[PDB]
From Swiss-Prot, chain A:
Pfam families found in the cross-reference section: Cpn60_TCP1 (PF00118)
Name this protein carries in UniProt: T-complex protein 1 subunit delta
Highest taxon of the lineage: Eukaryota
Alphabetical GO biological process terms: chaperone mediated protein folding independent of cofactor; protein folding
Family to which this protein belongs: Belongs to the TCP-1 chaperonin family.
Any one Gene Ontology cellular component term annotated for this protein: chaperonin-containing T-complex
Job of this protein: Molecular chaperone; assists the folding of proteins upon ATP hydrolysis. Known to play a role, in vitro, in the folding of actin and tubulin. In yeast may play a role in mitotic spindle formation.
Keyword set, alphabetical order: ATP-binding, Chaperone, Cytoplasm, Nucleotide-binding
Main location: cytoplasm
Description of how the protein assembles with itself and partners: Heterooligomeric complex of about 850 to 900 kDa that forms two stacked rings, 12 to 16 nm in diameter.
Subcellular location field: Cytoplasm
Gene3D superfamilies assigned: GroEL (3.50.7.10), GroEL-like equatorial domain (1.10.560.10), TCP-1-like chaperonin intermediate domain (3.30.260.10)
GO molecular function: ATP binding; ATP hydrolysis activity; ATP-dependent protein folding chaperone; unfolded protein binding
Swiss-Prot record, chain B:
Role noted for this protein: Molecular chaperone; assists the folding of proteins upon ATP hydrolysis. Known to play a role, in vitro, in the folding of actin and tubulin. In yeast may play a role in mitotic spindle formation.
Entry keyword annotation includes Chaperone: yes
Organism: Saccharomyces cerevisiae (strain ATCC 204508 / S288c)
Keyword Cytoplasm: yes
GO molecular function: ATP binding; ATP hydrolysis activity; ATP-dependent protein folding chaperone; unfolded protein binding
Name of the molecule in the record: T-complex protein 1 subunit beta
InterPro entries assigned: Chap_CCT_beta, Chaperone_TCP-1, Chaperonin_TCP-1_CS, Cpn60/GroEL/TCP-1, GroEL-like_apical_dom_sf, GROEL-like_equatorial_sf, TCP-1-like_intermed_sf
Swiss-Prot record, chain C:
GO annotation, biological process: chaperone mediated protein folding independent of cofactor; protein folding
GO molecular function: ATP binding; ATP hydrolysis activity; ATP-dependent protein folding chaperone; unfolded protein binding
Species whose genome carries this gene: Saccharomyces cerevisiae (strain ATCC 204508 / S288c)
Lineage per the UniProt record: Eukaryota, Fungi, Dikarya, Ascomycota, Saccharomycotina
Quaternary structure, from the entry: Heterooligomeric complex of about 850 to 900 kDa that forms two stacked rings, 12 to 16 nm in diameter.
Name of the featured protein: T-complex protein 1 subunit epsilon
A Pfam match: Cpn60_TCP1
PROSITE patterns linked to this entry: TCP1_1, TCP1_3
A GO CC annotation given for this chain: chaperonin-containing T-complex
Gene3D superfamilies: GroEL, GroEL-like equatorial domain, TCP-1-like chaperonin intermediate domain
Family per similarity comment: Belongs to the TCP-1 chaperonin family.
Length: 480, 489, 518, 502
């Protein structure tokens, strides 16, 4: 049965072989040829595993580890794959010594749990009340992007949006609270933070559309305005039930089957000055039902006043072909800290990479909200944990004592790979950092390089069950 | 003869690593490769994997009936059934003993194993508080080998306190399993108010007092300018049925099928809750909890029993409306709501909890328990060798081989945990041999400690079905000397 | 290039893996087939490396390791190769990391001298203070090395043979022990419990006449016992190849009868001139020589090996005289008593030449019930003579058997972080290389080598840094300090020295050129 | 390990059918095909068959030591050593047991096997007639597996009464084996008269009274004392005859010194020259020729003679005597039956076979049977054999297995099943069912009341004492010992290295 486990380790270590070359901004790119013939290149570790089209199922688990790494911490998807391959490489020599993989899996349980308590000892607790610490953390984290000049002004704007979800008492902090919407026109330095929900769609372009309303009600309506399948009388009766409830703003779900709202019904609502926003995606339905606290309405008989929302002012602002529609003045008890950020830019390639650059900035701040405190990166926490476990290995007993020594040696791949990808000598840099490690602990602080704790915390947690679930598979049989 | 032995061992070799909490998980893959899943359940692995050996399908079909009777220990039955047939190879090649004599030898050997658990069964009727701790130890053994083993320490009192609130028939229809995404597994709570996630009505009060629950099955949709006379005629015909419902004096109405707007609108002015989309499983649960009846005759009120509930409250949890009843009749039933991380974890926890509560349901009628953790198989192993004093010539090696097959379960269990199966099992027999039988195999520290202090016990009825069904299933496959397959169509 | 540092390490581990299971008291034996057809069985690595014939120069370095280790010490010859194999395994992993071979060699040299200073502080003295305390620990020290041989049966009685043999050949002021002074001897038949220690040379000889006296009397208070060693027999001279002397007439026939008849007593009277009792010669004697020497109580021995004559001349202060005209009273042997003692029912009936005063050499006496038992008892006692030689030379001793390798490995890992150099990687590899010995021994005892290594490390921290016994010796429990198990310090110091220096020379060879044979 | 374990089983599988009276014979064939011989001897099969396995050669030299002490039971030692190695494969591979633990397991199991035979050993000092019957039953088990089993009922009292006539050392030099063709095997008899297969003198009287036996060693062909060193140089044939007369001239004075001894019988190791053989007739001296080293040692144990290397004086020497020397003619060859010796400790058994092939198998059969009966004089304790001995020792193995460590538990328990492997093969060679028959005995021997044992004749369970099947205590303690040490040698070798041959 070891032939299956031995093949699973070799196939998994072969994955991280090319990942170690792409680690860091100075890393080496990897070539990937899709089955369709498209040639793509990039240094992103998560992109490599997505287009790799892995066959063997055990190696496919590394994709789920990188997916959960970005879904929570948002950074370190390349390093978590290398850390997993290090534990698998050390586990190969464990089988040659007569150690059963169950003891290997049970030893990683106490190794991962004790590593968290040790990680909290070296961590320096910070406070969310200090804005200067959050701005410099997000600004210097954008040094991996093409434009450094426009990355400085976006740091304080991203911190002020988190201050609403930054309240002391909290449980679930999700990035969906801040909706990033990109628009054509303007520059990067011009950004406005809206206090209410903002959609991606414009307003009625035909004649008669008010496009602006004060003291309006907004609610989700899943219905569709179409002739019955005399035609204007059926479309008017639908509009008469809405006029009785005094609903100023209507929302129609996007449906590719038939037309959303007929042009004859748009002219009928133009006299009543009722704004209608069509082409509503399913992703925006769950976003409006939370902040506004409204309810989806499937049919016309389900439309009532109690299921609608409240909005103080609804207007359409057009700046350089923008025509963006914003909503303010919710004034609802069910309202939550929902933040809307408008992204502006000239070229299409600008608002694309710039928006994706802001997601990584919000992930780093999200790490500090869930777990407070920060630690200077660059291999400092990896060497600190590896040295302390060397002394604790002498205090253990049994077969595990040999595993504690091999577990600490597996953490040395992180400082070694960073030294190799940067062109510096592997042995010369690693021995030099460990030399001064007897006195200095975390000393990278002057270079403003700070790695959040959740990245180092999730890297140990995800790799604990990953490596565990691998060795626990003693065979693979075809089942259909 | 070779195809039946190898075919049975190949089935046992698949689940041999899934036995015990320290066991290993088997991975499966289909042609699409996107359906691959990781589960240690023997019922999922055996049913999914196709086999070309018809003799191997007999052991799988027998395990299907055994899985529905208990739900726990199905893997141990499949392995034990393979150990009897695996040891039969030495009973033939180097022995040359008649197979039916070996079959008759298992019957005499199984009788000694049943009497061993009977003499070792110890139950305490007095001090029911101490009996609650016994159910806690049994619940920890059922949650083993499954993803719930993380929080099982907190889940021990969850399943224990739930069964103690029944006090009645062993039927499991009084317990409903609800799985909602979000939150840690330890956040699950126990509620006896019959939580229901199906919302009824458009505009209805979230709280109502002095409500009477009644079950009814009828079609309110269809019967059986010109269309206006037919639609109004159906409302007048169904109006007499609603008048009979108003004579029931009930403040709550439940229909199995859908409900038209006109009979639902009349329920609002009368203060009656209109409940729809009740499946067949919900009707059987509401009958044994709320004390309802089908009520198939509307021709006159007071032909059926009426239910009562103090408060019907609606709560919002997990981004979905829920129904929490309060102050019902015969509230002995309970509902367990588990909070998982993902849908993949929910599928493994559901069946694991359903099989765990199935064993605890039999613990109410059966108070006798035995010591687990490898100690049960060691006690029965000596009782087989004790009866070997009086035995026939050809039945001597057949009965003796049954005692060594009982020690194969802790041997494989020690191999799955990574410990030494030769050192631990051998030293365990020496202490149990003469006097003072307490300690058993421990899968944590690696030594032999007391199973009573660690809280590892097993039910008498659960362990009896393992030794019984496996001994009977092994005699069927060994008895068959020929396989005849017809032309497949 | 790359193939140089690969095949050399792989071939060295494959050859050394044979003697890994044979190192210990429980170590497994081997079957060594001689080219003549005789089968030999021994667990010692010194005979294995000498029996193995191969053309690979990498494994020949391990053979030469036990060559100088046997003549200098003769104890850790089996373990010095296994210890050297551990340094090659730890160095192979360092090569893949980009570490130069000299950096690995310099790392083992600095770690060797550092481990000696830590071990030198923990040694204890035995022969100090009471001198009787030395022989107390020395008596039980030889019983440890005899547990892996059939000698372990009677080993309690056999432990007194090696102790009393070294005392007679060594002085407290000189402290000199030579293996040439102790002649290896063994006999087949009888029981092994009858083996004793003789203060002088003891051979196995048979008299030519049954009525010769088995004991030599002092003959009214003479000086010692005079023994003559000559290369020519006393008898009428006869050719040893072909005779063929034709006599033509009765004249020369009657002359040769009278001549040879008179030469009988003339050759025997030469013994009375020198005043010697026992006469040892290379060639036999005539029937008249046995009759004349019988009435004078002068036993004679025939067919004596040339090598055995040198041992008699050293102990009895004798000389080799070529002819009968060169004999004198100063060349005769000197001994107190010569007698033939019968041992059991054996028909050999050897002779015992005693001394009753301290000489510079002794001769051991070993018996056995079977061929292979005799050869096993000789080699088992041969290593015991090497242990007692190192204990008397250096009073400072340290414990062994897997306890010392664990203690010495802990001091290296602590000082590795203080150097802050490149050799720090070689320091941790040197610490793990020392941990290979207790893991290798644990594999022969039927225990987990990983669990046993962790057990020895944990018990030496919270208790004390003193050595702790290992279950590999088959005793009741650990802590050999109570069982008086002592190993020589100079033997362990030279074992870790040559093993470390050999690993350096392997890395210093980057090219191996193997040509044909002539 | 794969070649040593499987290779040792193949060696034991060859001789496994030669154990027991119901066993089968193994046939061997060489390249010439004319040397084929059917024999059940285990020592002949192992020594003749060449083997390239170095591990198999270990059991060959060990079997030679076992054959020298007793000469029987050598097959059971090889089979028992092979069963321990066959079960060791299951103890190593699937049972997770260290090989040194298996070696230590047999050491603790050997102590329990010896203690079982000690408590079961029962001897009777009083009523020596009952002790004679025990020697009869032991002789029946030694003569088993051989053609002599036919007349073994008559041969039972032949070997029993022969040992009782020794009364002295256990050495076998007292009993001499003589084999003459013709007659049935039942015609063999016991004779203490020391039958000799060689005659004496050319023409001399057959019956001799008041003879004095004197053993002497001298060269009677060209006998000269201190005359060596001169040859015969003659220029003519007539001159050579003058020097040849010196042979008898110097011999006449040599006979005169021998004739002063006053002996009626002369014994020489070498031949005798023509003239003194005729001169001894006139002097009344009867010379004996063709006396080997074995014949001289047998005479020293009866009359007490000596080599007598000094002919220079009638005194300072020991001489023997005998009352009557009678010469008989049997099997067309002169025989010499002595009578009237002094406390004769020697016996002579003359076996009469049909062919030379039958006599070859009867030689080692009688020699090995009398070697076991000779050891029974020092140890009178006997045990019950016939499969019952191995069954009783199996209980003592499981008795000590109650309290034992983890690694040694399965190693000692495997030794209990190996003890039952010996009667298992015995039941297969007899034709019975080893499964059912042996299992019925273990049920009775399990708790108390151990008397009866396996019977290979009627097929039922009968008492070994009633059937007359017993075994010696000294024979079984040597089998359990040597076989245990033989298995440990092969378990201590995990590798074999052969030097380059020249």
């Amino acid at each position: 049965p070891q032939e299956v486990r031995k093949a699973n380790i070799i196939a998994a270590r072969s994955v991280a072989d090319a990942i170690r070359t792409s680690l860091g901004p100075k890393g080496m790119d990897k070539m990937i040829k899709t089955s369709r013939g498209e040639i793509i290149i990039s240094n992103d570790g998560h992109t490599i595993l997505k287009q790799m089209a892995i066959l063997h199922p055990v190696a496919r688990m590394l994709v789920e580890v990188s997916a959960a790494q970005d879904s929570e911490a948002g950074d370190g998807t390349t390093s978590v794959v290398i850390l997993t391959g290090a534990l698998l490489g050390a586990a190969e020599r464990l089988l040659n010594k007569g150690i059963h993989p169950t003891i290997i899996a049970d030893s990683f349980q106490s190794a991962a749990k004790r590593s968290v308590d040790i990680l909290l000892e070296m961590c320096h607790k910070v406070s969310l009340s200090d804005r200067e610490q959050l701005v410099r953390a997000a600004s210097t984290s954008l040094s991996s992007k093409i434009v450094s000049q426009y990355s400085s002004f976006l740091a304080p704007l991203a911190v002020d949006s988190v201050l609403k979800i930054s309240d002391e008492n909290s449980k679930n902090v999700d990035l969906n609270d801040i909706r990033l919407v990109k628009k054509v026109g303007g520059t990067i330095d011009d950004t406005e933070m809206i206090d209410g929900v903002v959609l991606t769609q414009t307003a009625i372009k035909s004649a008669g559309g008010p496009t602006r309303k004060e003291k309006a009600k907004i609610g989700l309506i899943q219905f569709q305005i179409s002739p019955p399948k005399e035609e204007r009388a059926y479309l008017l009766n639908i509009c008469k039930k809405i006029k009785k409830a005094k609903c100023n703003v209507l929302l129609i779900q996007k449906s590719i089957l038939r037309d959303a709202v007929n042009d004859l019904a748009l002219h009928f609502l133009s006299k009543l000055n009722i704004m209608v926003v069509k082409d509503i995606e399913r992703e925006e339905i769950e976003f409006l039902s939370k902040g506004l606290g409204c309810k989806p309405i499937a049919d016309i008989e389900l439309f009532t006043e109690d299921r609608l929302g409240s909005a103080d002012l609804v207007e359409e602002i057009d700046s350089d072909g923008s025509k963006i529609v914003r909503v303010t003045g919710i004034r609802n008890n069910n309202a939550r800290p929902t933040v809307s950020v408008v992204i502006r830019g000239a070229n299409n390639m600008i608002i694309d990479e710039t928006e994706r650059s802001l997601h990584d900035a919000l992930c780093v701040i999200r790490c500090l909200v869930k777990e407070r405190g920060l630690i200077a990166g660059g291999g400092a926490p990896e060497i600190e944990i590896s040295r302390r476990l060397s002394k604790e290995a002498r205090s253990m007993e049994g077969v595990q004592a040999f595993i504690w020594q091999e577990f600490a040696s597996a953490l040395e791949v992180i400082p070694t790979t960073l030294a190799e990808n940067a062109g510096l000598n592997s042995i010369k840099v690693v021995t030099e950092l460990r030399s001064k490690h007897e006195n200095g602990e975390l000393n990278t602080y002057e270079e403003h390089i700070l790695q959040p704790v959740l990245v180092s915390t999730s890297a140990i947690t995800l790799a604990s069950e990953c490596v565990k679930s691998i060795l626990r598979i003693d065979d693979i049989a075809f089942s259909r | 003869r070779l195809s039946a032995f190898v075919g049975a061992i190949a089935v046992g070799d698949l689940v041999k690593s899934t036995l015990g909490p320290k066991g290993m998980d088997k991975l499966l893959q289909s042609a699409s490769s996107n359906t691959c899943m990781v589960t240690n359940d023997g019922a999922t692995i055996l049913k999914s994997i196709p086999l070309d050996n018809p003799a191997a399908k007999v052991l799988v079909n027998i395990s299907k009936v055994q899985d529905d009777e208990v739900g726990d220990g199905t893997t141990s039955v499949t392995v034990l059934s393979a150990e009897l047939l695996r040891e039969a190879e030495k009973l033939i090649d180097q022995s040359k003993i008649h197979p039916q004599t070996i079959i008759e030898g298992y019957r005499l050997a199984s009788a000694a194993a049943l009497d061993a658990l009977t003499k070792a069964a110890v139950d305490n009727s007095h001090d029911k508080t101490m009996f609650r701790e016994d159910l806690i130890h049994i619940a920890k053994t059922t949650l083993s080998s499954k993803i719930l083993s993380q929080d099982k320490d907190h889940f021990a009192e969850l399943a224990t306190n739930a069964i103690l609130r029944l006090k009645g028939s062993t039927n499991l229809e009084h317990i409903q399993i609800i799985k909602i995404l979000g939150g840690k597994l330890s956040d699950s709570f126990l509620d006896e108010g019959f939580i229901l996630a199906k919302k009824f009505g458009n505009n209805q009060p979230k709280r109502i007092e002095n409500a009477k629950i009644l079950i009814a099955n009828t079609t309110l949709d269809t019967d059986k300018a010109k269309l206006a006379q037919l639609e109004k005629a159906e409302r007048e015909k169904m109006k007499n049925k609603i008048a009979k419902i108003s004579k029931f004096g009930i403040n709550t109405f439940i229909n199995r099928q859908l409900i038209y707007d006109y009979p639902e609108q009349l329920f609002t002015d009368l203060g009656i809750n209109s409940i729809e989309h009740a499946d067949f499983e919900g009707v059987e649960r509401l009958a044994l909890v709320t004390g309802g009846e089908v009520v198939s005759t509307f021709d006159e009120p007071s032909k059926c029993k009426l239910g009562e509930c103090d408060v019907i409250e609606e709560i919002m949890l997990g981004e979905q409306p829920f129904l929490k009843f309060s102050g019902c009749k015969a509230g002995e039933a309970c509902t367990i709501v588990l909070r998982g991380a993902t849908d993949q974890t929910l599928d493994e926890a559901e069946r694991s909890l359903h099989d765990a509560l199935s064993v605890l349901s039999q613990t109410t009628k059966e108070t006798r328990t035995v010591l687990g953790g490898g100690c049960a198989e060691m006690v029965m192993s000596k009782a087989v060798d004790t009866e070997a004093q009086n035995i026939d010539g050809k039945k001597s090696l057949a009965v003796e081989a049954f005692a060594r097959a009982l020690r194969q379960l802790p041997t494989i269990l020690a191999d799955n945990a990574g410990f030494d199966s030769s050192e631990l099992v051998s030293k365990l027999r020496s202490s149990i041999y003469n006097g003072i039988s307490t300690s058993g195999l421990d899968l944590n520290n690696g030594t032999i400690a007391d199973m009573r202090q660690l809280g590892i016990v097993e039910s008498y009825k659960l362990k009896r079905a393992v030794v019984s069904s496996a001994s009977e299933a092994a005699e069927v496959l060994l008895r068959v000397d020929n396989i005849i397959r017809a032309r497949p169509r | 290039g790359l193939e140089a540092k690969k095949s050399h390490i792989l071939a060295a581990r494959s050859v050394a893996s044979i003697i890994k299971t044979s190192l210990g008291p429980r170590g497994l034996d081997k079957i060594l087939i001689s080219p003549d057809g005789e089968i030999t069985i021994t667990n010692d690595g010194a005979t294995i490396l000498s029996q193995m014939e191969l053309d690979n120069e990498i494994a020949k370095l391990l053979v030469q390791l036990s060559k100088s280790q046997d003549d200098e010490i003769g104890d850790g010859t089996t373990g010095v190769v296994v210890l050297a194999s551990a340094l090659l395994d730890q160095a192979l992993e360092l090569i893949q990391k980009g570490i130069h071979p000299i950096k690995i060699a310099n790392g083992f040299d600095e770690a060797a001298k550092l481990a000696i200073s830590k071990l030198e502080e923990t040694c204890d003295d035995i022969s100090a203070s009471n001198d009787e305390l030395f022989r107390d620990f020395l008596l039980r020290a030889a019983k440890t090395s005899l547990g892996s041989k059939i000698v372990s049966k009677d080993h309690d009685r056999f432990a007194e043979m090696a102790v009393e043999a070294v005392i007679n050949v060594m002085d407290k002021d000189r402290k000199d022990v030579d293996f040439d002074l102790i002649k290896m001897q063994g006999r087949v038949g009888g029981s092994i419990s009858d083996s004793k220690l003789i203060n002088g040379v003891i051979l196995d000889k048979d008299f030519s006449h049954p009525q010769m006296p088995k004991c030599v009397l002092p003959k009214e208070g003479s000086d010692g016992v005079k023994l003559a060693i000559l290369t020519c027999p006393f008898e009428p001279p006869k050719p040893k190849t072909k005779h063929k002397l034709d006599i033509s007439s009765v004249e020369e026939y009657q002359k040769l009868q009278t001549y040879e008849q008179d030469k009988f007593k003339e050759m025997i009277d030469d013994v009375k001139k020198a005043g010697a009792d026992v006469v040892i010669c290379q060639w036999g004697f005539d029937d008249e020589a046995n009759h004349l020497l019988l009435q004078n109580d002068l036993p004679a021995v025939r067919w004596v090996g040339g090598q055995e004559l040198e041992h008699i001349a050293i102990s009895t202060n004798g000389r080799i005289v070529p002819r009968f005209q060169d004999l004198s009273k100063d060349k005769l042997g000197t001994c107190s008593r010569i007698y033939e003692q019968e041992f059991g029912t054996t028909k050999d009936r050897m002779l015992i030449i005693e001394q009753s005063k301290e000489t510079k050499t002794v001769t051991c006496f070993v018996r056995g019930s079977n061929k292979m038992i005799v050869d096993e008892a000789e080699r088992a006692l041969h290593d015991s003579l090497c242990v007692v030689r190192n204990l008397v030379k250096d009073s400072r001793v340290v414990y062994g058997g897997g306890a010392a390798e664990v203690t010495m490995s802990l001091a290296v890992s602590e000082e590795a972080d203080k150097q802050r150099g490149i050799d720090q990687y070689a320091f941790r590899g040197f610490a793990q290389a020392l941990d290979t010995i207790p893991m290798t021994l644990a594999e022969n005892s039927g225990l987990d080598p990983i669990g046993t290594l962790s057990t020895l490390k944990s018990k030496q921290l919270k208790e004390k840094i003193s050595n702790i016994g290992v279950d590999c010796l088959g005793y009741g429990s650990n802590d050999m300090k109570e069982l008086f198990v002592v190993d020589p310090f100079i033997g362990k110091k030279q074992q870790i020295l040559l093993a470390t220096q050999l690993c350096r020379m392997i890395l210093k060879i980057d090219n191996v050129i193997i040509s044909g044979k002539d």
